[PDB]
Amino acid sequence: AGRWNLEGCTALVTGGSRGIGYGIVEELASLGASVYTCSRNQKELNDCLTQWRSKGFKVEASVCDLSSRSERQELMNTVANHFHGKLNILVNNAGIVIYKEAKDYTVEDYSLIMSINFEAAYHLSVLAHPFLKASERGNVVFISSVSGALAVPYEAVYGATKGAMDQLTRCLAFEWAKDNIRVNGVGPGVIATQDPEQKENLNKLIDRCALRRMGEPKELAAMVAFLCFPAASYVTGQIIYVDGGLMANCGF
């Protein structure tokens, strides 16, 4: 790739059929990357491919259920073949939230959120490893959240999964250094992708931003792409927040 671009870089973005992931797929594609992404919705992915290839983006996508170990293993094989065994980038963007107090979560709830938020990311990171190391210039960008480090309503368990992800990110930056793989995390705040109380809770977050507004999917994606540029060669083991200043606030 060029210093400030991703020309010739193959990337896998998990969960790129909409919102943030969608923004990340367009962002990396528009910088010359051939992106492979997936989701559960058969119909939504094909509408994405419609628009992506319409803007000229070099993409590819299949349906996936990242809650399944076999589905994840199958995915890597499928993508590892699509790129011929060389993967430059891996964006662990997939995740879900179950709005319930920590004391209301059921076993089915916990197991499901843990599976998609952390285990699925961890697992696809290990599977991707041989190909990232074989790419000569590998990069893993975990999509975390401000919720992974600071308390947000009905996100006690969603935060736990992100806190484990952040720590795994730091550790992999060290463990996979010898394979020329840089591992970083990007924690979004409120990104513009109902219930009276959730409306206010969403309002409290925008209100606590310096910019006093939600971000756009391309604003978070700009940071992911960058971390993949050859220019960011010395950046690794970091959790960088794209949040309009939310993380740094207290009394504003």
Q: Domains along the chain?
A: 1-252 (3.40.50.720)
Catalytic position from the list 99, 105, 158, 234 = 158
Q: Closest Cα to residue 18, out of 216, 189, 193?
A: 193
DSSP assignment letter at 191 = B
The question of whether 99 is a catalytic residue gets the answer no
For tokens 């947000």, the residue is: 152
* CA–CA distance, 181 with 164 (Å, rounded to integer): 20
The residues near 231 (Cβ < 8 Å, ≥ 6 apart) are: 3, 4
Residue whose entry in the numeric block shows the structure tokens 């959240």? 145
What residues are designated binding site for substrate?
145
Query: Which residues are CB-neighbours of 188 under 8 A, at least 6 positions away?
Result: 20, 143, 144, 145, 146, 215, 220, 241, 242, 243
Which segments are annotated as binding site?
17-40, 145, 191-193
Positions at the binding site for NADP(+) = 17-40, 191-193
Cα–Cα distance between 27 and 20 in angstroms, integer? 10
- Which of 172, 184, 186, 187 lies closest to 238 in space, CA to CA? 184
The technique is X-ray
* DSSP designation for 118: I
Structural contact between residues 247 and 193, judged by C-beta atoms closer than 8 angstroms: no
162-166: long-range contacts at Cβ-Cβ below 8 A with a sequence spacing of 24 or more? 162/95, 162/117, 162/187, 164/118, 165/92, 165/117, 165/118, 165/121, 165/122, 166/142, 166/239
> Resolution in A, one decimal?
2.3
